[PDB]
Design a protein around this ligand. Structure first.
Ligand SMILES: O=C(c1ccc(O)c(Sc2ccc3c(c2)OCCO3)c1)N1Cc2ccccc2C1
Length: 208
């Protein structure tokens, strides 16, 4: 059973700008997603201090980068706090409306797309390199969900019957055909070293 939702108008406009604007410095998507993982890991660690049972779904706190040339996917997996259905369906888009307008206005004022994370909407930089983004996520006391969007104004949510994750978030980037450099070991390593050097969790770059 698949539910289809419309993006808020401001978010659809943001995704169209990210897809249509000429901007060569696309590699910033990876820093934004690793930062979101790091924040998610921070939060489950923080909450586990007053409720240790929140780590019953997994004590290890890490980030995995997994390229797959055959599927043309780059997957970023973390064991952070995960997202609820409400996070996916309504609540994150609500928060993102304010930051989106501010980011739009800053871009008109001379800001650069690489500043997107200062407005809380860095996730959408995934569309610099991906034609479709699939997000698998598991929050404690909620189901495992698959969120998915190829832009165009809509996204889907379904309960996910794939491999159980325990807890956390998996962002699957289905790369555009001219963006396969982000499947190369040397390129991913260069980007992580340049932009994600001080992340406070082990980042493992898988190879094939
Ligand atoms: O679970 C996550 C997570 C982890 C790694 C990521 O790259 C992303 S990207 C992303 C962002 C927004 C979305 C979306 C994907 O999909 C559809 C709805 O809104 C999210 N949390 C949870 C959590 C709690 C506190 C602070 C920061 C965070 C982040």
């Amino acid at each position: 059973e698949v539910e289809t939702f419309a993006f808020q108008a401001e978010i659809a406009q943001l995704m169209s700008l990210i897809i249509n604007t000429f901007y060569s410095n696309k590699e910033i998507f990876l820093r934004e997603l690793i930062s979101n993982s790091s924040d998610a890991l921070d939060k489950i660690r923080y909450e586990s201090l007053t409720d240790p049972s929140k780590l019953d779904s997994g004590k290890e706190l890490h980030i995995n980068l997994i390229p797959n040339k055959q599927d043309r996917t780059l997957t970023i997996v973390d064991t952070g706090i995960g997202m609820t259905k409400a996070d996916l369906i309504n609540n994150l888009g609500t928060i993102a409306k304010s930051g989106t307008k501010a980011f739009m206005e800053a871009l008109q004022a001379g800001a650069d797309i690489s500043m997107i994370g200062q407005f809380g909407v860095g996730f959408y930089s995934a569309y610099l390199v991906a034609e479709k983004v699939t997000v698998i996520t598991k929050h404690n006391d909620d189901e495992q969900y698959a969120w998915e969007s190829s832009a165009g104004g809509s996204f889907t949510v379904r309960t996910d019957t794939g491999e159980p994750m325990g807890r956390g978030t998996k962002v699957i980037l289905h790369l555009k055909e001219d963006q396969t450099e982000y499947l190369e070991e040397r390129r991913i390593k260069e980007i992580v070293k340049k932009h994600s050097q001080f992340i406070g969790y082990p980042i493992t770059l898988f190879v094939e």
